[PDB]
Amino acid sequence: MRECISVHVGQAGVQIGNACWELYCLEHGIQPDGQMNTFFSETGAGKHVPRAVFVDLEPTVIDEVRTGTYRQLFHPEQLITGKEDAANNYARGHYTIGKELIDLVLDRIRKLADQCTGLQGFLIFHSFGGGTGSGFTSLLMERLSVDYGKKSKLEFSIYPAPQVSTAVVEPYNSILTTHTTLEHSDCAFMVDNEAIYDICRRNLDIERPTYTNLNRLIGQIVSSITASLRFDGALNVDLTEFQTNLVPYPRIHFPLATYAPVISAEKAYHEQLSVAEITNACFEPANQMVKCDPRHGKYMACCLLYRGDVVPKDVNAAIATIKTKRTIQFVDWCPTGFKVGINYQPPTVVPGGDLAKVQRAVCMLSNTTAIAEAWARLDHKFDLMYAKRAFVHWYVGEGMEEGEFSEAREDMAALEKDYEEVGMDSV
Amino acid sequence: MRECISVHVGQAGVQIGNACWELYCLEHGIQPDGQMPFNTFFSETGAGKHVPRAVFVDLEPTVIDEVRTGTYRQLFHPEQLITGKEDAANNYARGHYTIGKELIDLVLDRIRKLADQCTGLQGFLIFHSFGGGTGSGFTSLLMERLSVDYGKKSKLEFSIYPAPQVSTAVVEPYNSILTTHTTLEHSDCAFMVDNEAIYDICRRNLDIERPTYTNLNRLIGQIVSSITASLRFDGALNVDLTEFQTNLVPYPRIHFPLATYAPVISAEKAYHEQLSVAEITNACFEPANQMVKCDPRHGKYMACCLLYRGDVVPKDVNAAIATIKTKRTIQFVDWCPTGFKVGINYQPPTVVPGGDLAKVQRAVCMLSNTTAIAEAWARLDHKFDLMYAKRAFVHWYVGEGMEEGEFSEAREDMAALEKDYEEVGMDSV
Amino acid sequence: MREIVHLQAGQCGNQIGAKFWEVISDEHGIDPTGTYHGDSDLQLERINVYYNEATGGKYVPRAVLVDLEPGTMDSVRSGPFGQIFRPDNFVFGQSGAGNNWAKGHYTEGAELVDSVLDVVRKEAESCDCLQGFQLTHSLGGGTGSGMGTLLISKIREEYPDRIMNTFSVVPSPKVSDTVVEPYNATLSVHQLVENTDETYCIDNEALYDICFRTLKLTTPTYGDLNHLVSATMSGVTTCLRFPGQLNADLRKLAVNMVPFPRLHFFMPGFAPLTSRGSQQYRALTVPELTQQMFDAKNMMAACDPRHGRYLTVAAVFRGRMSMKEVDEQMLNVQNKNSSYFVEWIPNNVKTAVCDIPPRGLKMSATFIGNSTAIQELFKRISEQFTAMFRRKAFLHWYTGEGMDEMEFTEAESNMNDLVSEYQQYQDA
Amino acid sequence: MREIVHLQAGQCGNQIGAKFWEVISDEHGIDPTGTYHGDSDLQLERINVYYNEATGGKYVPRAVLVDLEPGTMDSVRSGPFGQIFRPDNFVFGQSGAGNNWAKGHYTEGAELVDSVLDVVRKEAESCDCLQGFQLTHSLGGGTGSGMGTLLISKIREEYPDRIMNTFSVVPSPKVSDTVVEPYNATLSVHQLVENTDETYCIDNEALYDICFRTLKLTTPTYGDLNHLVSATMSGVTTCLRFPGQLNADLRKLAVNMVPFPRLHFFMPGFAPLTSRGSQQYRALTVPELTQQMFDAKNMMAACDPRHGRYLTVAAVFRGRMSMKEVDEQMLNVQNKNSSYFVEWIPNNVKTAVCDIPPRGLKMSATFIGNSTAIQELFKRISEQFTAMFRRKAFLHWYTGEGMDEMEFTEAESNMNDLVSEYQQYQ
Ligand SMILES: Nc1nc2c(ncn2[C@@H]2O[C@H](COP(=O)(O)OP(=O)(O)OP(=O)(O)O)[C@@H](O)[C@H]2O)c(=O)[nH]1
Ligand SMILES: Nc1nc2c(ncn2[C@@H]2O[C@H](COP(=O)(O)OP(=O)(O)OP(=O)(O)O)[C@@H](O)[C@H]2O)c(=O)[nH]1
Ligand SMILES: Nc1nc2c(ncn2[C@@H]2O[C@H](COP(=O)(O)OP(=O)(O)O)[C@@H](O)[C@H]2O)c(=O)[nH]1
Ligand SMILES: Nc1nc2c(ncn2[C@@H]2O[C@H](COP(=O)(O)OP(=O)(O)O)[C@@H](O)[C@H]2O)c(=O)[nH]1
Ligand SMILES: [Mg+2]
Numbered sequence A: 001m002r003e004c005i006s007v008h009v010g011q012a013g014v015q016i017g018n019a020c021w022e023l024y025c026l027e028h029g030i031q032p033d034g035q036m037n038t039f040f041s042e043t044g045a046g047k048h049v050p051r052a053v054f055v056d057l058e059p060t061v062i063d064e065v066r067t068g069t070y071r072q073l074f075h076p077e078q079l080i081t082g083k084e085d086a087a088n089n090y091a092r093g094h095y096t097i098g099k100e101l102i103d104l105v106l107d108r109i110r111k112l113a114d115q116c117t118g119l120q121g122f123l124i125f126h127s128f129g130g131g132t133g134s135g136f137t138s139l140l141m142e143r144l145s146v147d148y149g150k151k152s153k154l155e156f157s158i159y160p161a162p163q164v165s166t167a168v169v170e171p172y173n174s175i176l177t178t179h180t181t182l183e184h185s186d187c188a189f190m191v192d193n194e195a196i197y198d199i200c201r202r203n204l205d206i207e208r209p210t211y212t213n214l215n216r217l218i219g220q221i222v223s224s225i226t227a228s229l230r231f232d233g234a235l236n237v238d239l240t241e242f243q244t245n246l247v248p249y250p251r252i253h254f255p256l257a258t259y260a261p262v263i264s265a266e267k268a269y270h271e272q273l274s275v276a277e278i279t280n281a282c283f284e285p286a287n288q289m290v291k292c293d294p295r296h297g298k299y300m301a302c303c304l305l306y307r308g309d310v311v312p313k314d315v316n317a318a319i320a321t322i323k324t325k326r327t328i329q330f331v332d333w334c335p336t337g338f339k340v341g342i343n344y345q346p347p348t349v350v351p352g353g354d355l356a357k358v359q360r361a362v363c364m365l366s367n368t369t370a371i372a373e374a375w376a377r378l379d380h381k382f383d384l385m386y387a388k389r390a391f392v393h394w395y396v397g398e399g400m401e402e403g404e405f406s407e408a409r410e411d412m413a414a415l416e417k418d419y420e421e422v423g424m425d426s427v
Numbered sequence B: 001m002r003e004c005i006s007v008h009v010g011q012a013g014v015q016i017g018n019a020c021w022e023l024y025c026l027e028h029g030i031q032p033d034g035q036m037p038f039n040t041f042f043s044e045t046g047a048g049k050h051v052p053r054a055v056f057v058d059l060e061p062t063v064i065d066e067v068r069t070g071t072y073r074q075l076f077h078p079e080q081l082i083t084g085k086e087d088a089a090n091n092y093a094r095g096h097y098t099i100g101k102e103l104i105d106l107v108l109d110r111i112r113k114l115a116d117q118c119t120g121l122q123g124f125l126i127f128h129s130f131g132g133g134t135g136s137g138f139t140s141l142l143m144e145r146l147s148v149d150y151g152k153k154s155k156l157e158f159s160i161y162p163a164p165q166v167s168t169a170v171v172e173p174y175n176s177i178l179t180t181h182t183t184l185e186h187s188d189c190a191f192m193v194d195n196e197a198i199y200d201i202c203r204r205n206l207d208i209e210r211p212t213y214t215n216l217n218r219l220i221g222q223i224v225s226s227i228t229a230s231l232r233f234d235g236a237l238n239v240d241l242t243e244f245q246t247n248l249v250p251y252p253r254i255h256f257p258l259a260t261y262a263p264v265i266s267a268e269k270a271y272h273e274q275l276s277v278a279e280i281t282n283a284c285f286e287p288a289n290q291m292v293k294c295d296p297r298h299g300k301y302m303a304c305c306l307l308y309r310g311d312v313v314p315k316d317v318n319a320a321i322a323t324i325k326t327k328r329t330i331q332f333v334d335w336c337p338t339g340f341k342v343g344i345n346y347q348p349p350t351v352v353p354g355g356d357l358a359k360v361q362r363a364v365c366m367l368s369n370t371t372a373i374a375e376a377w378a379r380l381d382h383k384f385d386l387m388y389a390k391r392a393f394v395h396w397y398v399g400e401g402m403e404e405g406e407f408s409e410a411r412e413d414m415a416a417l418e419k420d421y422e423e424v425g426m427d428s429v
Numbered sequence C: 001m002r003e004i005v006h007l008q009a010g011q012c013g014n015q016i017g018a019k020f021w022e023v024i025s026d027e028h029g030i031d032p033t034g035t036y037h038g039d040s041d042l043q044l045e046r047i048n049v050y051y052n053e054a055t056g057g058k059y060v061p062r063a064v065l066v067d068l069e070p071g072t073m074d075s076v077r078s079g080p081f082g083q084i085f086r087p088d089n090f091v092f093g094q095s096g097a098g099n100n101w102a103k104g105h106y107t108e109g110a111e112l113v114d115s116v117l118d119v120v121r122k123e124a125e126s127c128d129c130l131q132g133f134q135l136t137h138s139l140g141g142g143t144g145s146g147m148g149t150l151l152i153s154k155i156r157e158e159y160p161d162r163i164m165n166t167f168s169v170v171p172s173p174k175v176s177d178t179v180v181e182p183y184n185a186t187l188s189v190h191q192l193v194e195n196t197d198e199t200y201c202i203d204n205e206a207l208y209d210i211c212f213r214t215l216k217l218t219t220p221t222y223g224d225l226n227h228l229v230s231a232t233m234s235g236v237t238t239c240l241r242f243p244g245q246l247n248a249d250l251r252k253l254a255v256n257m258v259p260f261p262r263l264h265f266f267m268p269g270f271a272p273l274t275s276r277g278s279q280q281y282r283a284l285t286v287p288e289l290t291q292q293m294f295d296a297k298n299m300m301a302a303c304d305p306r307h308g309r310y311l312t313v314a315a316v317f318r319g320r321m322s323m324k325e326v327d328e329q330m331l332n333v334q335n336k337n338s339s340y341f342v343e344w345i346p347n348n349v350k351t352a353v354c355d356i357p358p359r360g361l362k363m364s365a366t367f368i369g370n371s372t373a374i375q376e377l378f379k380r381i382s383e384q385f386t387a388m389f390r391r392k393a394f395l396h397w398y399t400g401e402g403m404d405e406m407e408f409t410e411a412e413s414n415m416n417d418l419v420s421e422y423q424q425y426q427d428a
Numbered sequence D: 001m002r003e004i005v006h007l008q009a010g011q012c013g014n015q016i017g018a019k020f021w022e023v024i025s026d027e028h029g030i031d032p033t034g035t036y037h038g039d040s041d042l043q044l045e046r047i048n049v050y051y052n053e054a055t056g057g058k059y060v061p062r063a064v065l066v067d068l069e070p071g072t073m074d075s076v077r078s079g080p081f082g083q084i085f086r087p088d089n090f091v092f093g094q095s096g097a098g099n100n101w102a103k104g105h106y107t108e109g110a111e112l113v114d115s116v117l118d119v120v121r122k123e124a125e126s127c128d129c130l131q132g133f134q135l136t137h138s139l140g141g142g143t144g145s146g147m148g149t150l151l152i153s154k155i156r157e158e159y160p161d162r163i164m165n166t167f168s169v170v171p172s173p174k175v176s177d178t179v180v181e182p183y184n185a186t187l188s189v190h191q192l193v194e195n196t197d198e199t200y201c202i203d204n205e206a207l208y209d210i211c212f213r214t215l216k217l218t219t220p221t222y223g224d225l226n227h228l229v230s231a232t233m234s235g236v237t238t239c240l241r242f243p244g245q246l247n248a249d250l251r252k253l254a255v256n257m258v259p260f261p262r263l264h265f266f267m268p269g270f271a272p273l274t275s276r277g278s279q280q281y282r283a284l285t286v287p288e289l290t291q292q293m294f295d296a297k298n299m300m301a302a303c304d305p306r307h308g309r310y311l312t313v314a315a316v317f318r319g320r321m322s323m324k325e326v327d328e329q330m331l332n333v334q335n336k337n338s339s340y341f342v343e344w345i346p347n348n349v350k351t352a353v354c355d356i357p358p359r360g361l362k363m364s365a366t367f368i369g370n371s372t373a374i375q376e377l378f379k380r381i382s383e384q385f386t387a388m389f390r391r392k393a394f395l396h397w398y399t400g401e402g403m404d405e406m407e408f409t410e411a412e413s414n415m416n417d418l419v420s421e422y423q424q425y426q
């Protein structure tokens, strides 16, 4: 009965939204006119109207949603498009909208939040690609910080895969994307898409995968992340026990997550599953959600959510054995510092998802220091670039000056100081 | 019983009188030929026929003539539709001095015919516009004759205000300052509803592109039922005409509240929304959903007067108004502790066929006096001052009786009223 | 109910009246034999404005038609219409004016005037209350200019409150017909700025240029040009004839126009004038194409706004229209063009809407504009009056006719007073 | 749904006003009388990029066209699609320059530049959705290159907001279509310097090197060339008219493509270029066609690759397609051929996705080769204006139409700025 509002921005966000609202509207009995718990309120007629901060600039963003199957599910005034376009960069997306699309919806956020019962958090999906997925989050996040207080805002992300990265030009967006997540910090996952494509190749038996299969998986991510406020309470935890409990400081909030649902119906419905074998497959290095090898860093504090047919005996047995495991290089200051939270619905899939009908799922969520290799790779690319004054003009026309990329560079160098100071021992 | 009389002047009165007497017949059981198969407004004959108490006075005969040949031929008694010969031609001077005083004695002889029938009368409702000639010239001459001949009765009046940006005439600022000053001493409580702000609600809220002349009148015509649903039906707290006349205006040079009707939603936007009694009190004080282009974020709320209709409950009414006063996202007064007025009534609004306002179980009419009406006059202070700087258009007005000092002696009264909105807006020590 | 008495004057006056009494007789649905023929009862209810009921249910118009040569006046009796006129209302001289203003003002035409004003009272005493008379004429020759001023100043005394309109035809240099053209229209503006409530300026050069470049005709003869252009702007008074939502008759529109009582000169225009071929391809919404007329290809007078400032502008529309798109299209036109308007008036436009379009059209509109660019016509006709009067070119047909040489120097300074008043408000 | 007004000028300009307006009039289903013929209803809503309503639902394009003499505007009017253009916006010239530049520039087209600004303010009035005028010229012309430059002049000096996509035909210097075409080329490559935003180089041999070498056509035509001069290459503008995964628009496109505000030069290929004898043996997929673009045979512009740096790259793709092998095979050839690819550029593309494929094509991978390294063919033109400068080939013609010798020596010291702006990367 605990309540939230979700955000699907950009192509990655809105196909994750196709997926995520599809699974919300299948795990509740939401049929396309309204009459058949945790995200809406009803009317005099009495019917599911999903509360909704969305932001989209384009001509034809979600007009395919409006033409789609679920067309009278979403009430149209709450879903936001304008008459003009923000041309896509961090700069133009930041600075021709701050009179246009976010400031008449600062009055619209009236209806969508007040009548929720437990006003607990927001769920924001963003991509590090371009000036909609990454650059339209910043305007939004300073609105949420300056008007909301201490509510949680959970960032789900795509990481730019460590060799291939395609949108409007990524690094000058990305540097102030994380200089944006400096401002408002709760917890921010990333996914490398290439590891998804290869686990699609090997665990799933999908030869020539496509665009669809990623976003249903990000739907199962947000499902087992924040459906603990939605389903039954055995040891009922929230995102209030997720954001407080993963990451201590606002410097490093970048975890990774390999599920029991990463395995398909054709292949791993065959395999026997138990809690130990699932958590072993979780802490194995190949299946990770961002392509960083977990052994090349320090496991800071793993904060678990649980689905499936788990038991408090065996989850604590696996927790204890993982905490003993030392090829998992643990952090120095404490082996402890976890969190667990309970639901009980076994995986029977949504249409368009290729996974199995097994009785179980486990949601690995782990913070590691082992991604500073990829962060130094991205910082290497940015300071490889900017010293030749390439792509100056259409970042500097609308507000993102030459000295502002350099202050962003030195802020992120201090953040790599925070990386090594958290990772390394102290006396 | 208690009863009152509607008066309409000009095109802007007849074209909303014919749209507000539309709503009254569909509220009750009266079919347009009169014989029904409410006795405050209507009047019985000996044969079951019903005749409303309304005078449609105007000068140009081609706007009253749709009443005499339209659907409503036999409803209005034909001695109550009063027409002239030639129009006022957008002059305050022609409609007050030269062409008006032939009709001062005919209408003031017909008003006694309706009021002799009246057992104990309450109000005379006026529907005039500040733009044209007979809506501002003859209206001013009418309200200084009603107060003389009918003593101390309540007189309510409306407006179709000259908008800031858009305007349908060039000689509008001359008429509007000349019509406020001479009715500043006779009128009791005027309603400012700007003609421009009803356009924009028809874009955002009730999304009808190209709104014609009718679809402004049906939205104004629903206010006049909501203000006078207490003289017709039974309620928990019925509020009569005198009842909210004194709860609204603090000083007798300050009588200009504003109006706001809370549910205006399309029927595609009545699927998905609660229409809750706390949800349609948020929407009255939003600056977008008002009905005059003056935002009260720059103003202090001198008073409010709320009127509710439909299926409301008097527990959640007081729960909402507490939740209003606490927040600083919406602003309030600095020295008026009570500040409010609440009315309740039972019958929900009835939708006339062909309309666009969808059928809503719970409707709110809102009335408030702000200190933010000064910016619609310090605007109008200067726009008349552009005109009168070089004596534009004065030769038309001076030829029919006015000296040129009556442009200044009505300017200086109006130029001293701005302090009357500044001396009360300042805090007290 | 609010009567209008039509006056005509000259050969140009009788080829406007024979084409104006054709358009209005199609609106009210009247046969050439003069009976009633239409379908709706909305037509006949305001027929007592321009017409008059005769016996047997006939309908005749109230028009006093003049000329000094009977050759024009016979040709109206044998036309497409013209049997509906009463034959008593035709007055005409015996010998022509000689294309001379002085002949047509003092000696040759003043015998006719006491018969012409004598018909006018008969079409005035049958009335209820007149809005006022209406004179259609030309500033070229003596039967239209000299009679036209003598008719106006003999009426404006005896019937002063009732308004007066006139439809002038000012001369043009590059399309000029008579050598005496700048010697008449300079001397008759002096008698026209005193006794007229509302004047127009419809010159033949502009009506040629809109006939080869907008309508794209091949042979624009005088019947095919007067009807489709200048006999249909006189149907701007559908407000006074048909009911509408926001209406404004002929008198309500004069008070929003003249900010000083000597500046009444207008430049009209009609909005749908596409072609025979481009009527197929355009959109009959309320656009801004002919409705931002500033690129002045469709303006019915010579001079245009680019050179000066508009004082006040009208727009009288006709059709089942929406009154939001009237008003936001008075907002793409006052701000996307910005400095051609008078600084000290912020809302220059008077609008009106009525409900019966012309035949065959969904949509129509009429534009009436006042400007400070009209002073370039009045300088330019006084350049060719100063030049010819310097050497006393064609003088002696004027000194021998009772007019002295003092009445030319009055009508040169007073002709240049109007240049002085309009140049004051050029930028200010 | 965002408006373009397809600007075009010259004897090429009103002929490229045939074949661009074939594929667009096929994409949205334009009958010869205007009223609709397409089936699906996504085609009707996005259609008001170009056309305009009328009575009876007729659609008519808003396009400013300029032609040289009245004898070339008509040979496309009496074609299959000439009945659809309303003929007010064909502007006409009594006298042309006859392979020169400025006859209709100062004095003969001074009335034509004062009438098309009674036209662009008559049909680019309603720019509520407009992101750019696709503006093209022909620069051997006099009214297509004098007025076409005075379309650039009295618009882009006022409003800098527009994208400027040139199919403006620079005549190539191997076999030029005229001896005297260099003179009005060196004012034109200069007129490509100041304002242009996304810009190809059309050298007509590089269209002439398509039909033989790739499409196997024995006897081509300009009207057979013109499917490639513009009609395939206005598959840049597709995302505003049809949606996709990663939707685009030209103003949105215009802010990734301009590093340094002048340099503007490409080398594309509409990657479907196979014959009908080589239509039997090609799989139509988003991998395979772009992997066929990379050769030395598929270009619409200038350069043989390995002959310079790759300062930017762009892309627009088609259809419901695969998100992975777009990004598997783009980097599989980016970082394998590390000799050609410049060191200091990571992520320069903008992979836009268009849902509706071009008609009759199963899957049509499209790609555009951005660069700045076209200067293996743009120093050869600029060393052949100076032949006519020193000996003064036609200046006795040139100076008489209100012209001095300071106008064409400005374009000696300021055309060389673009040569002085590859000065940083040689
Ligand atoms: N997870 C996932 N990512 C996708 C999918 N399709 C495209 N993307 C990625 O989304 C990233 C860029 O984010 P987008 O939402 O597409 O771009 P945007 O900036 O938000 O929107 P634009 O400004 O129009 O580009 C690209 O790197 C794509 O790889 C998909 O189906 N699933
Ligand atoms: N478009 C429109 N305007 C209306 C309507 N009702 C009233 N008006 C307004 O009426 C005002 C002027 O009224 P007029 O037509 O001049 O009538 P009047 O005020 O009595 O003056 P007269 O014309 O002399 O009768 C203008 O501000 C109009 O906007 C309506 O239903 N539609
Ligand atoms: N509108 C219009 N103008 C005309 C027509 N015929 C002539 N004109 C012009 O109007 C003027 C008419 O001269 P007019 O005064 O009637 O000649 P007069 O009667 O002999 O003095 C001349 O200057 C002509 O150029 C016509 O049929 N219609
Ligand atoms: N590439 C290409 N060139 C064209 C086309 N139509 C005309 N041209 C070229 O236009 C040039 C001459 O056209 P233009 O300069 O406007 O006409 P001119 O004044 O007679 O020389 C020649 O180089 C032609 O090759 C076309 O469709 N494609
Ligand atoms: Mg009137």
Ligand SMILES: [Mg+2]
Binding pocket: A010, A011, A058, A132, D245, D246, D247
């Ligand atoms: Mg997108």
